[PDB]
Write a protein that binds this ligand. Structure first.
Ligand code: CA
Length: 150
């Protein structure tokens, strides 16, 4: 009984052209040790020509505490054919015991209110139910534990 593990499931009911990108997801502790969410980050990858400072994000719900405890930031991802941006989600608090699940809800937008095209976004899963989603990644202490980077 000696390893940590996470798994992400997510889906978006937004149409492929959308003002908001929904990054709401759930995450399970699949290992056999409790996890401090302060050590965890998650990435949602996409493609956009706008600068990271031309987008804004919001988190509306966090099952393990206040929504204020979920902090996000946009980053550039250069030199990759499959994506050129990610939103990284981090946590100020929260604990997940083995087999427990957490949820967040959140969306991001362009400052100029123009629409995103999501068909070229690596992490987009247009669906109406949960399944394991390998195109969002999760890390513990900066080590990759779930998913596949672009
Ligand atoms: Ca896009």
């Amino acid at each position: 009984g000696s390893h940590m593990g996470l798994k992400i499931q997510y889906y978006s009911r937004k149409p492929h052209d959308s003002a908001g990108i929904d990054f709401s997801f759930r995450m399970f502790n699949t290992g056999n040790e409790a996890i401090d969410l302060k050590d965890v980050k998650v990435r949602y990858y996409f493609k956009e020509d706008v600068s990271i400072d031309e987008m804004n994000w919001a988190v509306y719900f966090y099952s393990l505490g206040s929504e204020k405890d979920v902090q996000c930031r946009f980053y550039e991802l250069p030199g990759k054919k499959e994506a050129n941006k990610y939103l990284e989600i981090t946590f100020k608090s929260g604990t997940l015991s083995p087999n427990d699940v957490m949820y967040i809800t959140g969306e991001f937008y362009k400052n100029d209110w123009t629409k995103f095209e999501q068909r070229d976004d690596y992490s987009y899963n247009p669906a109406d139910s949960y399944s394991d989603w390998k195109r969002m990644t999760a890390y513990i202490s900066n080590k990759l534990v779930w998913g596949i980077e672009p």
